Amino acid sequence: GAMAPSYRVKRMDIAKNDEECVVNAANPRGLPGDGVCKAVYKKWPESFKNSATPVGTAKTVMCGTYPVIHAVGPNFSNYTESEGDRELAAAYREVAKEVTRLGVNSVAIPLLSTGVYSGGKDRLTQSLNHLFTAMDSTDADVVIYCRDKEWEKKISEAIQMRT
Template identity: 35%
Template sequence: MSTLIIECVRGDIANQPDMDAVVNAANAQLLPGAGVAGAIHRAAGPELADACRALAPIATGEAVISSGFGLPNRFVIHCLGPIYGIDEPSADLLADCYRHALKLADDHGLASIAFPAISTGVFGYPFTEAARVAIATVMSFADGVPCLERVRFVLFSEADQAEFQRVLDEVRKADGGDA
């Protein structure tokens, strides 16, 4: 049985100083953009964009890792989520983002990682469906990542945080209360 702590908080993904890594909801070229990608790049500084040039492009569902530079985190894990209704199968590709990010966290011996709600912004993934995929994937992967102690979902609004928490509680109950 896993001892992984999974939590849902309202906050700024670029201001999670107690996490080893934050996840960037990236574009294929890993460039600064709007939303999460813009916030992370602004906080990390121009060195992040320089480092990302060598890592890009990435395909939908893939993840790569870089230094955190000006962020309070050692690492940024960049994931390219699916554009809902275009990149199919969307649920599998979204789950791949979380699995690949968790694998990178494990490969680097990280104890904590903070995720945004990948693909729910301009990529149009329905929020509750995305929450179900994210939480189910993290919970199913937990036993395979022994060094990981904490996964945090950082949500932008109070309503988003409440919905992720509702889905987390629902999945925990269905799973018998683990995680």
């Protein structure tokens, strides 16, 4: 575990992370995809061997010895708000199981279902709160990756609020 497990946020490409493993915002079919998934495909293409997994699950595949945790958030275009919320919570619980199993001291994680899968809604608070519910009981250093300057401030404020 980390000596004083923390949450941090960085605004940059998750393919440049400084952590012991990465969570991919994957699609269920293990396809290269877009956004976080395409950056992950470019950096760790070997990790997409047999990475297909259902919605609400995570499947880890090694790129050399570096673990890529493929986490499949729901596409809110297809799910009801209610069923989408259940699957988004579930995907993060499966990420916490994998991070624990791998014995890493740190993990890079994007906010699931906040981009192309958001159904055109702002889901920062919803996705971040499911991330916390899952990860609070782990002792890995969690580093959250985002792209948007305003999201960086809101994530930073949410982390600081609880400290």
